[PDB]
Design an enzyme around this catalytic site. Structure first.
Site, PDB file in Angstrom:
ATOM      1  CG  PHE A 122      -2.355   0.316   0.894  1.00  0.00           C
ATOM      2  CD1 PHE A 122      -2.855   1.598   1.093  1.00  0.00           C
ATOM      3  CD2 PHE A 122      -3.206  -0.664   0.391  1.00  0.00           C
ATOM      4  CE1 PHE A 122      -4.183   1.899   0.799  1.00  0.00           C
ATOM      5  CE2 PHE A 122      -4.533  -0.374   0.093  1.00  0.00           C
ATOM      6  CZ  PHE A 122      -5.023   0.911   0.296  1.00  0.00           C
ATOM      7  CD  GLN A 243      -5.677  11.147   1.709  1.00  0.00           C
ATOM      8  OE1 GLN A 243      -5.352  10.187   2.410  1.00  0.00           O
ATOM      9  NE2 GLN A 243      -4.784  11.948   1.134  1.00  0.00           N
ATOM     10  CG  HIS A 245      -8.027   7.828  -3.094  1.00  0.00           C
ATOM     11  ND1 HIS A 245      -7.465   7.101  -2.066  1.00  0.00           N
ATOM     12  CD2 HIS A 245      -8.026   7.013  -4.174  1.00  0.00           C
ATOM     13  CE1 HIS A 245      -7.147   5.896  -2.505  1.00  0.00           C
ATOM     14  NE2 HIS A 245      -7.477   5.817  -3.780  1.00  0.00           N
ATOM     15  CG  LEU A 255     -11.848   4.607  -3.398  1.00  0.00           C
ATOM     16  CD1 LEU A 255     -11.104   5.911  -3.206  1.00  0.00           C
ATOM     17  CD2 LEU A 255     -11.775   3.770  -2.134  1.00  0.00           C
ATOM     18  CD  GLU A 258      -2.641   4.655  -1.913  1.00  0.00           C
ATOM     19  OE1 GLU A 258      -2.843   5.727  -2.523  1.00  0.00           O
ATOM     20  OE2 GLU A 258      -2.128   4.606  -0.775  1.00  0.00           O
ATOM     21  NE  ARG A 289      -5.033   6.175   0.408  1.00  0.00           N
ATOM     22  CZ  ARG A 289      -6.221   5.728   0.814  1.00  0.00           C
ATOM     23  NH1 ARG A 289      -7.101   6.555   1.363  1.00  0.00           N
ATOM     24  NH2 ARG A 289      -6.535   4.447   0.665  1.00  0.00           N
ATOM     25  CG  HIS A 356     -10.523   8.953   0.271  1.00  0.00           C
ATOM     26  ND1 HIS A 356     -11.229   7.953  -0.362  1.00  0.00           N
ATOM     27  CD2 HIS A 356      -9.895   8.366   1.317  1.00  0.00           C
ATOM     28  CE1 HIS A 356     -11.042   6.813   0.278  1.00  0.00           C
ATOM     29  NE2 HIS A 356     -10.238   7.036   1.301  1.00  0.00           N
ATOM     30  NE  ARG A 400      -6.926   7.016   6.102  1.00  0.00           N
ATOM     31  CZ  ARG A 400      -7.447   6.831   4.892  1.00  0.00           C
ATOM     32  NH1 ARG A 400      -7.610   7.858   4.066  1.00  0.00           N
ATOM     33  NH2 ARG A 400      -7.809   5.616   4.506  1.00  0.00           N
TER      34      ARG A 400
HETATM   35  C1  LIG Z   1     -15.382   7.444   1.927  1.00  0.00           C
HETATM   36  C2  LIG Z   1     -14.523   6.216   1.977  1.00  0.00           C
HETATM   37  C3  LIG Z   1     -13.668   6.062   3.064  1.00  0.00           C
HETATM   38  C4  LIG Z   1     -12.838   4.948   3.163  1.00  0.00           C
HETATM   39  C5  LIG Z   1     -12.869   3.982   2.155  1.00  0.00           C
HETATM   40  C6  LIG Z   1     -13.724   4.131   1.065  1.00  0.00           C
HETATM   41  C7  LIG Z   1     -14.553   5.246   0.967  1.00  0.00           C
HETATM   42  C8  LIG Z   1     -15.459   5.373  -0.226  1.00  0.00           C
HETATM   43  N1  LIG Z   1     -12.050   2.874   2.237  1.00  0.00           N
HETATM   44  C9  LIG Z   1     -11.200   2.710   3.313  1.00  0.00           C
HETATM   45  C10 LIG Z   1     -10.374   1.591   3.399  1.00  0.00           C
HETATM   46  O1  LIG Z   1     -10.398   0.738   2.517  1.00  0.00           O
HETATM   47  N2  LIG Z   1      -9.523   1.429   4.475  1.00  0.00           N
HETATM   48  C11 LIG Z   1      -9.491   2.386   5.472  1.00  0.00           C
HETATM   49  O2  LIG Z   1      -8.741   2.252   6.438  1.00  0.00           O
HETATM   50  N3  LIG Z   1     -10.310   3.495   5.392  1.00  0.00           N
HETATM   51  C12 LIG Z   1     -11.165   3.673   4.318  1.00  0.00           C
HETATM   52  N4  LIG Z   1     -11.987   4.790   4.244  1.00  0.00           N
HETATM   53  C13 LIG Z   1     -11.960   5.830   5.337  1.00  0.00           C
HETATM   54  C14 LIG Z   1     -12.761   5.373   6.568  1.00  0.00           C
HETATM   55  O3  LIG Z   1     -12.915   3.968   6.588  1.00  0.00           O
HETATM   56  C15 LIG Z   1     -14.137   6.030   6.670  1.00  0.00           C
HETATM   57  O4  LIG Z   1     -13.979   7.414   6.884  1.00  0.00           O
HETATM   58  C16 LIG Z   1     -14.968   5.374   7.778  1.00  0.00           C
HETATM   59  O5  LIG Z   1     -16.148   4.854   7.211  1.00  0.00           O
HETATM   60  C17 LIG Z   1     -15.335   6.303   8.932  1.00  0.00           C
HETATM   61  O6  LIG Z   1     -15.985   5.542   9.925  1.00  0.00           O
HETATM   62  P1  LIG Z   1     -16.773   6.232  11.149  1.00  0.00           P
HETATM   63  O7  LIG Z   1     -17.324   5.166  12.067  1.00  0.00           O
HETATM   64  O8  LIG Z   1     -15.878   7.185  11.906  1.00  0.00           O
HETATM   65  O9  LIG Z   1     -17.990   7.035  10.467  1.00  0.00           O
HETATM   66  P2  LIG Z   1     -19.010   6.365   9.414  1.00  0.00           P
HETATM   67  O10 LIG Z   1     -18.542   4.997   8.987  1.00  0.00           O
HETATM   68  O11 LIG Z   1     -19.193   7.278   8.227  1.00  0.00           O
HETATM   69  O12 LIG Z   1     -20.383   6.207  10.236  1.00  0.00           O
HETATM   70  C18 LIG Z   1     -21.217   7.323  10.431  1.00  0.00           C
HETATM   71  C19 LIG Z   1     -22.317   6.959  11.417  1.00  0.00           C
HETATM   72  O13 LIG Z   1     -22.686   8.099  12.170  1.00  0.00           O
HETATM   73  C20 LIG Z   1     -24.093   8.216  12.237  1.00  0.00           C
HETATM   74  N5  LIG Z   1     -24.531   9.625  12.179  1.00  0.00           N
HETATM   75  C21 LIG Z   1     -24.057  10.618  11.360  1.00  0.00           C
HETATM   76  N6  LIG Z   1     -24.736  11.756  11.633  1.00  0.00           N
HETATM   77  C22 LIG Z   1     -25.631  11.503  12.613  1.00  0.00           C
HETATM   78  C23 LIG Z   1     -26.570  12.299  13.264  1.00  0.00           C
HETATM   79  N7  LIG Z   1     -26.967  13.433  12.697  1.00  0.00           N
HETATM   80  N8  LIG Z   1     -27.361  11.742  14.251  1.00  0.00           N
HETATM   81  C24 LIG Z   1     -27.231  10.409  14.590  1.00  0.00           C
HETATM   82  N9  LIG Z   1     -26.298   9.629  13.935  1.00  0.00           N
HETATM   83  C25 LIG Z   1     -25.513  10.165  12.965  1.00  0.00           C
HETATM   84  C26 LIG Z   1     -24.665   7.426  11.073  1.00  0.00           C
HETATM   85  O14 LIG Z   1     -25.837   6.756  11.473  1.00  0.00           O
HETATM   86  C27 LIG Z   1     -23.556   6.464  10.688  1.00  0.00           C
HETATM   87  O15 LIG Z   1     -23.846   5.154  11.116  1.00  0.00           O
END
Ligand SMILES: *Cc1cc2c(cc1C)nc1c(=O)[nH]c(=O)nc-1n2C[C@H](O)[C@H](O)[C@H](O)COP(=O)(O)OP(=O)(O)OC[C@H]1O[C@@H](n2cnc3c(N)ncnc32)[C@H](O)[C@@H]1O
Ligand SMILES: C/C=C/CC/C=C/CC/C=C/CCCCCCC(=O)OC[C@H](COP(=O)(O)OCCN)OC(=O)CCCCCCC/C=C/C/C=C/CCC
Ligand code: HEM
Ligand SMILES: CC(C)NC(=O)c1ccccc1I
Ligand code: SF4
Ligand code: F3S
Ligand code: FES
Lengths: 613, 239, 138, 102
Positions: A122, A243, A245, A255, A258, A289, A356, A400
């Protein structure tokens, strides 16, 4: 009041978010024996970590022999020395331990001849403190890494008695005299407002990718908790660092990982040259990145675009073995055919640098405690914690390293659960809140539901997204960033002219997009104002006018006969941003970077140096 | 200009005695995305923002945009619209589910069934977990291929007639596939007692191989295959 | 909250509400394996009712089987109508028999793919016609 | 663990393959011994067949009893009716023979 059914819930801990970090924190608290509640606007599975493709970083060393301290060096080298080395220490320390935890939870990791977890190359990884070669330390479940991660995390989460408020939009935090008391959330199902009070609150709402027009992130990646902290008067760290990407499909902006470059993927310009030799000859096309994507955007500059519009670049898989693509990258093989209409093993994939990850977020220490800035010093905000993409312990810093955020999720999500369990015992009396609390949030809901304006929810969203995509791009000048500022600032005043259509209680997606819009704006003003004030080229934020690295010392020449620059003269510091909610004025101060690690003897501090990978 | 016709199911619960009815929408495809979700977003963002539907990833891995497009339960971001303007695209919610509002189904029962099968790894020695990674061979890993990818979009069970007539007691192909997914996993020891839970006529045996589940999967998976594979394990397992 | 406690609160909410169900067979597109499975039930119900009306008539109706055919012979035999009445007996039988093998093949696990359903589906439909025409004249 | 619904599925399939091997056997070898085995397997498979149609459609507690008790009455009266037809008449094998030769 009296208009909405207010229902108060009593808990020991509240976790806002159901992503990777949200879950690990939620059941990790119930594991210690806490009565935990979990608030989420989506269903746990339908978060975003599902979209994760690359993998989870761990120094297990199943391919070659590996040391976790080498993973520390590359993370802090990749962070462009803005990364807090104490948090990077703890994350790379727990790296192997926390992944073996997930494999034992049920994660269907890909395997090798020995039967151990498949680790693969990676961008940014290296053996023997950047001297050995290319390190293989990215644990993966064949392109669907985060998908199977979240499912196994959710799988385990049903072992414990945790009250999941499924599809509940949290509006703001219950705050009283600098003390956190819980959250005020709206039920999406009937429209009733819930004041969920608890002794501790963990924020894991993820990033604000939807601030830009072109992003790999989901529609529900709006940075709600980042704006929840913003409204409470608390600061937000390093929000200007965004970021970009390198590899994202030209069409919808999806996406492709990488990990494509890790297996043997190559980036080719229109003329035919593998351009990742003119820029980064040391680490080929598997560079940082930020460096890879910045090289791509500079290839469009010349007029060497690969399409009929001459704007995108190609990622080639034409030469890769037939079954290696089917086994190691089955997810991208399908999504490239669905969206781009491209056969992966016959044609190259049209890719473009797109938004990203959000490096910044809520200011945090290694323990998971949310930090405020009092008298140029760090103070712990009581009963408030943050983890994941939503937070900024600055384990990523300015840039990152690829595949680190899933580690950031599981490690710091686990850390928050442990920081509470060691802070107090489950049974410590819940701090009572005044009956008038959450008034400014309920009134905001009522004012936004009946909102009669001139421009609608969608018109203001496109106005913000296209402006950020044009002004705060890969390359940014003090001319366009200053122009973008009062362009964004004006759109915050436009929030008074909002046009809503739905007046219903049950499932008002028109209203909650507008609630997301108010949250997106706060994570847009701080991104653009923080960028225009910062005048240096570091990580993702590269200035055209200020193309130099501004550190305390000129780290090219030996450190001896050099005068140390005062704190307000070098930009090797965290950009903390505040904003008055009424006027939209963005005021910003700074926090020093953490250089000292958790233990010098176990892991040495890496001094700043020139980084051209 | 290329105007496409869309017929969409609509029911507003905040309208006092409102009956469910269809609504037509006029959309030009020149300045619109290739997928159905892009068109649903377009009318939401331009024509009528009273349309209420689930969305997230627009990538086909979260399973939010699950609905019935022209008599077939697929994902909206995966399915592309038929360019033939002479036909009107019919968009309905997941068949035989309690409608909350416009294309949004109540899946509280669907998730609860998934909660009842225990989709987590179970060991006899859980005292030694979280320190040493469990060994699994490459072929034992292949036994999980075409099974773990399940997004739980619920397009599966909602296409099954048995899940229409007995959705309360019958788990459905989506849930049953995951139960099977945790049976052949070489790391799981609780294989026999997972099969013991299905020893009633309704939990599993209400499947009559209608095969509408496999024919509708957005991920190209074969759920029915796994159900008939469970039935084989059910008749053969010792003690 | 437990596993089946969520199911209880699902039914205690939705059944006592004004929430309408989404249309099922009213809207769902007709597929061949689906329609062939409906007919397998239809031929099952028709045949079981045929055998039930045969045994019950043996206990309730007077006279032997030979004399029951002498009234069928009394009503002047139909030219090709005797072939038509004989056709609408083996047609529901042979369809159910051939598809009954196909259902039994699925029990062993083989041939559960989508292409194989339309492949072996037509085969059953054709072997029905070939053993309805070529069996009634035997 | 006690498997009861598992045997009902297997036992049904053993009757299915037995009934499949009876139709060609009754044509090639028509006798009184073939008449009783066919009548038994035919009324068994039919009973377990409708038994599935009842459990799929008949919603309720009071209705589930009556549909199963009512089916059991028809199934027992059909097997007895065929056994009376096999003993004090031409039998099933001869009945089809006289129906076709018309
Ligand atoms: C965008 C992205 C990021 C990503 C990736 C591919 C994409 C398209 N691939 C990754 C990978 O292969 N390896 C890696 O290490 N990282 C990768 N990323 C980055 C990262 O994984 C993401 O940023 C990750 O998904 C973040 O996780 P996190 O738990 O911090 O946040 P979330 O998954 O987006 O979950 C959001 C939750 O919050 C709740 N929510 C949001 N707003 C509210 C409000 N208003 N009230 C109540 N709940 C809320 C949602 O319900 C959701 O479940
Ligand atoms: C319940 C009972 C209701 C029965 C009515 C339904 C009739 C349809 C059965 C179709 C079976 C084909 C019979 C063809 C035939 O004419 O038999 C051969 C005949 C010429 O002799 P041959 O064969 O030339 O003699 C040479 C001896 N080797 O004589 C026989 O050998 C008799 C063989 C018939 C066996 C099939 C019995 C199965 C009944 C199915 C009931 C379906 C309910 C609807
Ligand atoms: C020897 C030829 C036959 C074969 C091979 C056969 C096979 C089968 C099989 C395997 C099934 C179960 C379908 C499933 O759910 O998977 C079935 C259904 C059924 N059969 Fe037959 N059968 C035959 C003749 C008959 C006859 C003569 C009758 C009339 C008494 C009959 C009545 C039924 C009924 C009522 C069902 C229930 C439909 C269902 O549950 O799907 N069958 N058949
Ligand atoms: C397709 C629907 C209307 N018919 C059924 O309900 C059905 C048909 C055959 C086998 C099992 C069943 I549950
Ligand atoms: S197995 Fe396929 S059709 Fe069924 S829920 Fe999963 S993704 Fe949907
Ligand atoms: S649609 Fe159906 S009854 Fe079985 S084969 Fe699939 S679950
Ligand atoms: S929105 Fe994620 S599957 Fe359609």
């Amino acid at each position: 009041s009296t208009q909405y059914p207010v229902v108060d819930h009593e808990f020991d801990a509240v976790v806002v978010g159901a992503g990777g970090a949200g879950l690990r924190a939620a059941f990790g608290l119930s594991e210690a024996g806490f009565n935990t509640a979990c608030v989420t606007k989506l269903f746990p599975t339908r978060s975003h970590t599902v979209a994760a493709q690359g993998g989870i970083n761990a120094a297990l060393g199943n391919m070659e022999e590996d040391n976790w301290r080498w993973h520390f060096y590359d993370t802090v080298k990749g962070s462009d020395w803005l990364g807090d080395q104490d948090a990077i220490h703890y994350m790379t320390e727990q790296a192997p331990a926390s992944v073996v935890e997930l494999e034992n939870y049920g994660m269907p990791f890909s395997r090798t001849e020995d039967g151990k977890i498949y680790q693969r190359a990676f961008g940014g990884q290296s053996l023997k403190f950047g001297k050995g070669g290319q390190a293989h330390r990215c644990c993966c479940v064949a392109d669907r890494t985060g998908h199977s991660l979240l499912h196994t995390l959710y799988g385990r989460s049903l072992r414990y008695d945790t009250s999941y408020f499924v599809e509940y939009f949290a509006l703001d935090l219950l705050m009283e005299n600098g003390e956190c008391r819980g959250v005020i959330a709206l039920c999406i199902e009937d429209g009733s407002i819930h004041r969920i009070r608890a002794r501790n609150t963990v924020v894991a709402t993820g990033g604000y990718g939807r601030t830009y027009f072109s992003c790999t992130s989901a529609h529900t990646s709006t940075g709600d908790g980042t704006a929840m902290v913003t409204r409470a008067g608390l600061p937000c760290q390093d929000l200007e660092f965004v970021q970009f990407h390198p590899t994202g499909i030209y069409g919808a902006g999806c996406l492709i990982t990488e990990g494509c470059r890790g297996e043997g993927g190559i980036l080719i310009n229109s003329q035919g040259e593998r351009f990742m030799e003119r820029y980064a000859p040391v680490a080929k096309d598997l560079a940082s990145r930020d460096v890879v994507s910045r090289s791509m955007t500079l290839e469009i500059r010349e007029g060497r675009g690969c399409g009929p519009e001459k704007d995108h670049v190609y990622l080639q898989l034409h030469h890769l073995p037939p079954e290696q693509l089917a086994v190691r990258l089955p997810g991208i093989s399908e999504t490239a055919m669905i969206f781009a209409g491209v056969d992966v093993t016959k044609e190259p994939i049209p890719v473009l640098p797109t938004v990203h990850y959000n490096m910044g977020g809520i200011p945090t220490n290694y323990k998971g405690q949310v930090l405020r800035h009092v008298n140029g010093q760090d103070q712990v905000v009581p009963g408030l914690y943050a983890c994941g993409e939503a937070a900024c312990a600055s384990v990523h810093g300015a840039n990152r390293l690829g595949a680190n955020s899933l580690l950031d999720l599981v490690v710091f999500g686990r850390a928050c659960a442990l920081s509470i369990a060691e802070s107090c015992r489950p049974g410590d009396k819940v701090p009572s809140i005044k009956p008038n609390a959450g008034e400014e949030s309920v009134m905001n809901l009522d004012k936004l539901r009946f909102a009669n304006g001139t421009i609608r929810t969608s018109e203001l969203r496109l106005s913000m997204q296209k402006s950020m995509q044009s002004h705060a791009a890969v390359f940014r000048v003090g001319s366009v960033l200053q122009e973008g500022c009062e362009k964004i600032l004006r759109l915050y005043g436009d929030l008074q002219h909002l046009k809503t259509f739905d007046r219903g209680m049950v499932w008002n997606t028109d209203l909650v997009e507008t609630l997301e819009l108010q949250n997106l704006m706060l994570c847009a003003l701080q991104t653009i104002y923080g960028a225009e004030a910062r005048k240096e080229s570091r990580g993702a934020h590269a200035r055209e006018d200020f193309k130099e690295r501004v550190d305390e010392y000129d780290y090219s020449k030996p450190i001896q006969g050099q005068q140390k620059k005062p704190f307000q003269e070098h930009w090797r510091k965290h950009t903390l941003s505040y904003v008055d909610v009424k006027t939209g004025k963005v005021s910003l101060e700074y926090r020093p970077v953490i250089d000292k690690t958790l233990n010098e003897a176990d892991c040495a501090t890496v001094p700043p140096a020139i980084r051209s990978y | 200009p290329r105007i496409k016709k869309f017929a969409i199911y609509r029911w507003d619960p905040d309208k006092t005695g409102d009956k469910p009815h269809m609504q037509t929408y006029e959309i030009d495809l020149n300045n619109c995305g290739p997928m159905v979700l892009d068109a649903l977003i377009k009318i939401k963002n331009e024509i009528d923002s009273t349309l209420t539907f689930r969305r997230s990833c627009r990538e086909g891995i979260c399973g939010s945009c699950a609905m019935n497009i022209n008599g077939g339960n697929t994902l909206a971001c995966t399915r592309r619209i038929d360019t033939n303007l002479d036909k009107v695209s019919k968009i309905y919610p997941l068949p035989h589910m309690y409608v909350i509002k416009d294309l949004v189904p109540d899946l509280s029962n669907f998730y609860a069934q998934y909660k009842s099968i225990e989709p987590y790894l179970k060991k006899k020695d859980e005292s030694q977990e979280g320190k040493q990674q469990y060994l699994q061979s490459i072929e034992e890993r292949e036994k999980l291929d075409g099974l773990y990818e399940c997004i739980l979009c619920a397009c599966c069970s909602t296409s099954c007639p048995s899940y229409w007539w007995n959705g309360d007691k019958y788990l459905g192909p989506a849930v049953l596939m995951q139960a099977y997914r945790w049976m052949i996993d070489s790391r799981d020891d609780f294989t026999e007692e997972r099969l013991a839970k299905l020893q009633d006529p309704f939990s599993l045996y209400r499947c009559h191989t209608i095969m509408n589940c496999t024919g509708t999967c957005p991920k190209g998976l074969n759920p029915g295959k796994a159900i008939a594979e469970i039935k084989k394990m059910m008749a053969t397992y010792k003690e | 909250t437990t596993a089946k406690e969520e199911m209880e609160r699902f039914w205690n909410k939705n059944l006592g509400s004004n929430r309408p169900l989404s249309p099922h067979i009213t809207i769902y597109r007709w597929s061949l394996p689906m329609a062939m499975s409906i007919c397998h039930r239809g031929t099952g119900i028709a045949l079981s009712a045929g055998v039930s009306l045969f045994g019950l008539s043996a206990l309730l109706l007077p006279g032997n089987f030979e004399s029951h055919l002498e009234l069928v012979k009394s009503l002047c035999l139909g030219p090709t109508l005797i072939y038509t009445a004989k056709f609408g007996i083996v047609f529901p039988l042979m369809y159910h028999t051939w598809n009954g093998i196909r259902h039994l093949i699925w029990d062993l696990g083989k041939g559960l793919t989508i292409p194989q359903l339309t492949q072996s589906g037509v085969v059953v439909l054709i072997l029905t016609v070939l053993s309805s025409v070529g069996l009634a004249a035997m | 663990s006690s498997k009861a619904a598992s045997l009902h599925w297997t036992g049904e399939r053993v009757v299915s393959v037995l009934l499949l091997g009876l139709l060609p056997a009754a044509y090639l070898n028509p006798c009184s011994a073939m008449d009783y085995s066919l009548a038994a397997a035919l009324t068994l498979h039919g009973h377990w067949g409708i038994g599935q149609v009842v459990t799929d459609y008949v919603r309720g507690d009071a209705l589930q009893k009556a549909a199963k008790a009512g089916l059991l009455a028809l199934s027992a009266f059909t097997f007895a009716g065929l056994c009376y037809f096999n003993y004090h008449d031409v039998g099933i094998c001869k009945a089809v023979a006289m129906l076709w030769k018309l």
